[PDB]
């Protein structure tokens, strides 16, 4: 259908690739396959090498694989058609990335990125195309996140039963998260304020609050409380935060908040919902959830 192409500065080496988003399946990875077109006359090194690199910019390299496109030492269903259309002067190359390697991620002004390069070695003879490693969301949900505590003080002789829960663990990007909060204060202190937040843990560590919701609800002594909140973490209010873990982007396009890291070097990203009660000595509770992208169907 479509094939992204990038011609080398001399126009002899023209890299062609079917896609540029290689999805890191949990068990395996998609094969990075392409074809390099060469002009035998221009080919003075008699050797063209294609590499698939995974850099951790800030340089560090985590996976370098070399395959000799020419001279010959199989072909994917797309490679054969591409060669047939482009003639007989094009030679195919393929890489099979192994699991346990990171997925593309950037830091909002870096991170782990991938690249496919081709060069004739025995500037003009060097063509580089940027690709991305990314992952979908788990196809099935996990157990409901429920978290309860009981914080007591010396003055009071009864528990302050705090509890929180989410409606599910898999929350796609741009989806509101409902945070069911319950309190039961048999103590004497006044429950001044309530806070709910969605926060990111990105370990290369830092913790930026992506979503916040502060309520002045007050629970009088010896009383219950139940309330459903709603937070939507998106990038509209997260553009002045340096160091935020953004998903990987090809050149400069705006992208969404980094997905979860389904499970290793690189940067590991996960998200947690926190419910906090500021009392007149503030109680807290946390739960995990999965922020990712769906799978087209």
């Amino acid at each position, epitope marked *: 259908t479509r094939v992204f192409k990038k011609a080398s500065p001399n126009g002899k080496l023209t890299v062609y690739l079917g896609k540029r988003d290689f999805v890191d399946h949990i068990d395996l990875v998609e094969p990075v396959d392409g074809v390099v077109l060469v002009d035998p006359e221009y080919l003075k090194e008699r050797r063209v090498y294609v590499t698939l690199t995974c850099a951790f910019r800030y340089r560090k390299d985590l996976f370098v694989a070399n395959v000799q496109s020419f001279p010959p030492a199989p072909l994917t269903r797309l490679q054969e058609r591409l060669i047939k259309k482009l003639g007989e002067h094009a030679y195919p190359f393929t890489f099979e990335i192994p699991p346990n390697l990171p997925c593309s991620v950037t830091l909002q002004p870096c991170g782990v990125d991938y690249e496919v390069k081709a060069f004739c070695a025995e500037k003009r003879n060097s063509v580089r195309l940027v690709i991305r490693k990314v992952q979908y969301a788990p196809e099935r949900p996990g157990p409901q996140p429920t978290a309860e505590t009981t914080r007591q003080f010396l003055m009071s002789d009864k528990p302050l039963h705090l509890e929180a829960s989410l409606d599910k663990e898999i929350y796609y990007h741009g989806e*509101p998260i409902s945070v069911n909060v319950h309190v039961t204060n048999n103590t004497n202190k006044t429950v001044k304020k309530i806070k709910i937040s969605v926060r990111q843990y990105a370990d290369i560590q830092y913790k930026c609050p992506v979503a916040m919701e502060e309520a002045d609800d007050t629970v009088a002594p010896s009383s219950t409380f139940c309330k459903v909140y709603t937070l939507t973490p998106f990038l509209a209010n997260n553009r002045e935060k340096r160091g935020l873990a953004l*998903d990987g982007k090809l050149k400069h396009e705006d992208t969404n908040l980094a997905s979860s890291t389904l499970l290793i070097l690189g940067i590991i990203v996960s998200y947690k919902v926190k419910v906090k009660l500021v009392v007149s000595s503030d109680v807290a509770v946390e739960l995990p959830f999965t922020l990712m992208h769906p799978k087209p169907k």
Partner: antibody
Amino acid sequence: EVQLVESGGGLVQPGGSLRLSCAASGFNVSSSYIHWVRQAPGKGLEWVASISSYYGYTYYADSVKGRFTISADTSKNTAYLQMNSLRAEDTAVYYCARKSMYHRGWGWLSWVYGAMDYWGQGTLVTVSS
Amino acid sequence: DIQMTQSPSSLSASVGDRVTITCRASQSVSSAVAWYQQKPGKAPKLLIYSASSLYSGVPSRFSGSRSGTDFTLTISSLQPEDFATYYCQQSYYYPITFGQGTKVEIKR
């Protein structure tokens, strides 16, 4: 299925104000672009404004830049067009449309601004003293 | 802005006539041209997007073509329900601009 419902159309004197509400069902207002369009009596379609909630982007035509504002409420899953300083020329029928940011293959296509595939029903706005 | 000049401003055709309508962008649009059909009073319906890509549910007679800035909407065999106002829209830059409609009338 996806649906959009427009509301907030009626008479208003020149220099007045209205507020059109577009309620979205079957999808999320954050994963899409939302557009306000209008067609005058005996004329053709005209694009008014557009919003993206997730990235916080707002665009307006040159004829409604300042007199109109567009915003979104993701808690209720709705979009609002606040129409100020209305005039007789604004008398028209207003439509709400949306463009999914999905279908790239993995994630968001944040620059397509593509075709508006789902439309509401159109609400008439009048302006006359 | 980008001015989308459309032609004919109106045309008369019978049943089975192989109608054809042309839109032309004042600037280099890149296959971001959508074709809609509005019947009297009702709301527009998307018919073509990306300047060549048919939309789900739209009949097969409608077709889109690109030859540069010159976009073409063709109907293989006009049918009674293909009597409305057809618009072209560039969804590449902002502000989005429509055409001028083309009332496909009847011939007598």
